[PDB]
Amino acid sequence: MKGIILSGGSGTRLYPLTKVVSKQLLPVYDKPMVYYPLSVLMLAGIKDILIISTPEDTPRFEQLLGGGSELGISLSYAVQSSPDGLAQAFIIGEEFIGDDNVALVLGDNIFYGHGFTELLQRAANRKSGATIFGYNVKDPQRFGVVEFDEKGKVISIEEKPEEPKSSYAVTGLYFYDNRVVDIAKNITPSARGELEITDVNKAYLELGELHVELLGRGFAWLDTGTHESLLQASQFIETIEKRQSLKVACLEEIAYRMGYISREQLIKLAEPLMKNEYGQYLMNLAHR
Numbered sequence: 230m231k232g233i234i235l236s237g238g239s240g241t242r243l244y245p246l247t248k249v250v251s252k253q254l255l256p257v258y259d260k261p262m263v264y265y266p267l268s269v270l271m272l273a274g275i276k277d278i279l280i281i282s283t284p285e286d287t288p289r290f291e292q293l294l295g296g297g298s299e300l301g302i303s304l305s306y307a308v309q310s311s312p313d314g315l316a317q318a319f320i321i322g323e324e325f326i327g328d329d330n331v332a333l334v335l336g337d338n339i340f341y342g343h344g345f346t347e348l349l350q351r352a353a354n355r356k357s358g359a360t361i362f363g364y365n366v367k368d369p370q371r372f373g374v375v376e377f378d379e380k381g382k383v384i385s386i387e388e389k390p391e392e393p394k395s396s397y398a399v400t401g402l403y404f405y406d407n408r409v410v411d412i413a414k415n416i417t418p419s420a421r422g423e424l425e426i427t428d429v430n431k432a433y434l435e436l437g438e439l440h441v442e443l444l445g446r447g448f449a450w451l452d453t454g455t456h457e458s459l460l461q462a463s464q465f466i467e468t469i470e471k472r473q474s475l476k477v478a479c480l481e482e483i484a485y486r487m488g489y490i491s492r493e494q495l496i497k498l499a500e501p502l503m504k505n506e507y508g509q510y511l512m513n514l515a516h517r
């Protein structure tokens with residue numbers, strides 16, 4: 230499976246932080262926001278990843294993250310000239326995707342919890358259908374909403390219903406079989422002017438192969454939508470990391486733990502960063 234991080238948008242809520250740059254370049258505590266969703270694809274076992282952003286921000290992501298080789302993966306880049314909807318990732322990424330299965334994650338989504346990598350790996354290893362991930366939120370009318378039965382099978386999915394059928398939002402992480410490319414090419418803009426991911430998921434529902442993984446209350450799916458929520462996300466990460474000796478979404482660590490790079494390669498990554506706490510963390514991991 231390949232992966233895509235959709236990381237543009239004409240985001241304005243966070244002005245003036247985003248006066249120049251896209252939100253996914255902003256810090257969440259001690260690392261750029263984009264590291265979080267990238268870490269999720271990597272933990273899923275996904276090693277070939279396309280990052281899509283605006284004309285002006287795509288080169289900024291490439292300067293930050295590089296070509297992937299340091300992390301034992303492959304990062305590629307494409308431009309979305311206008312934020313015409315999430316489903317457009319699969320049209321921009323047509324050539325990249327080829328005949329393969331593909332996961333999409335949003336560049337501003339942050340997931341965290343015990344047992345999450347088991348779920349990710351399961352979704353990435355599926356050879357047919359789609360997997361979406363549902364999460365209980367306070368104001369579900371503001372999200373895509375997945376309705377399911379007592380056995381956890383999807384009954385419906387609706388984009389920002391005025392009368393939500395459940396309390397479960399459909400989060401910004403999606404795993405698809407290769408049918409997603411032609412599905413994306415066949416749906417039409419909503420009233421919003423957007424090629425809606427909810428429409429892609431409706432198509433998989435109708436095909437009888439939309440699977441939902443319900444993330445319980447022991448998971449965090451953090452809001453980076455406002456200044457207030459960005460700050461709460463930062464504090465959440467700080468708290469988890471301060472207590473343990475352990476980082477959330479440290480890319481070099483994940484590359485080593487996943488077998489993408491060797492202990493030898495991790496040491497070489499740590500060496501030039503030994504003046505800062507981040508390099509020292511990588512070196513400790515190498516030793517231990």
Ligand SMILES: Cc1cn([C@H]2C[C@H](O)[C@@H](CO)O2)c(=O)[nH]c1=O
Nearest residue numbers: 235236237238312313314315337
């Ligand atoms: C509609 C749209 C949103 N986005 C981003 C902005 C937000 O971070 C997220 C959901 O709006 O997706 C894109 O990158 N491209 C798009 O076309």
Ligand SMILES: Cc1cn([C@H]2C[C@H](O)[C@@H](CO)O2)c(=O)[nH]c1=O
Nearest residue numbers: 340341342343345477478482483
């Ligand atoms: C092993 C490991 C897990 N994680 C995340 C995935 C889950 O959200 C949580 C528990 O495994 O920690 C990382 O961020 N980095 C890691 O190196």
